[PDB]
């Protein structure tokens, strides 16, 4: 199916002394492959997946250079944005940046993205066509004029449409044993009674990859959203994900309810029902 490569970066200022805390993470789909933490002892981009360990010194040197450059740009930015917003030197502020590319089943470029935020709010982002920018306020508009004059969009577009895609294909090929493998959810239903007239049915999906999944309930073959609770998809910690969906039902009527599970690893969606 589809794939993506995305990098996330977070810089938090330390106004009383020193440089900001900078954490960078890179993903292929739902798999973390590299990380950089300014508080770590290596001061190097580090591997987080076995398939990236085969890259040589040249690659690690390159990634470390580029990531340090990203941290210094955020360092400067924190000061520049502090001024744009007339803020004092006493508080801690955050800059977040996320960029990457999506590809289709054929591995060809689908779309690219580059978003930047200040204190958790939109700041500036590249538009879908990758040729212009969306600035949320007048400070971000000052950045947009800088970026237009320095032709930043052109540079990014070339990276997003080309380089990003090329590296994503290299990674999918090198990590094929896991990256190109889909792990279907292991499903089961549990039952719980709170009183003599009400019961809860919980449909579980475990050990799946990728994270995208759809869990839905039906009553007599009709979709049912009322009286349902769906938890956020969560990581199991071994690279797979979990999620559950519950429906509250009149005790004794459990057999009318069915859980439906949709996932890339299932050649056909599955249905679960509670037996007596």
């Amino acid at each position: 199916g589809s794939h993506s490569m995305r990098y996330f970066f977070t810089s938090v200022s330390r106004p009383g002394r020193g440089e900001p805390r900078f954490i960078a993470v890179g993903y292929v789909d739902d798999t973390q492959f590299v990380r950089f933490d300014s508080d770590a002892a290596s001061q190097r981009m580090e591997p987080r997946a076995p398939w990236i360990e085969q890259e040589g010194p040249e690659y690690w040197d390159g990634e470390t250079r580029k990531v340090k450059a990203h941290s210094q740009t955020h360092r400067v930015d924190l000061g520049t944005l502090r001024g744009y917003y007339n803020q004092s030197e006493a508080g801690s502020h955050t800059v977040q940046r996320m960029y990457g590319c999506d590809v289709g089943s054929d591995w060809r470029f689908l779309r690219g993205y580059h978003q930047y935020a200040y204190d958790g709010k939109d700041y500036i982002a590249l538009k879908e066509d990758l040729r212009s920018w969306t600035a949320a306020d007048m400070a971000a508009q000052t950045t947009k004029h800088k970026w237009e004059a320095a032709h930043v969009a052109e540079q990014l577009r070339a990276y997003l449409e080309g380089t990003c895609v090329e590296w994503l294909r290299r990674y999918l090929e090198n990590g094929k044993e896991t990256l190109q493998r889909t792990d279907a959810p292991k499903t089961h239903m549990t039952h719980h009674a709170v009183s003599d007239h009400e019961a809860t049915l919980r449909c579980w999906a475990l050990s799946f990859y990728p994270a995208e999944i759809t869990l839905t309930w039906q009553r007599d073959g009709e979709d049912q959203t009322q009286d349902t609770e769906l938890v956020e998809t969560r990581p199991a910690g071994d690279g797979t994900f979990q999620k559950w969906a519950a429906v509250v039902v009149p005790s004794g009527q459990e057999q009318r309810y069915t859980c439906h599970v949709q996932h890339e690893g299932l050649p056909k969606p599955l249905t679960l029902r509670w037996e007596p």
Partner: peptide
Amino acid sequence: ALWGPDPAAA
């Protein structure tokens, strides 16, 4: 691989 060589300052 990351975007390079050096992200433009805001």
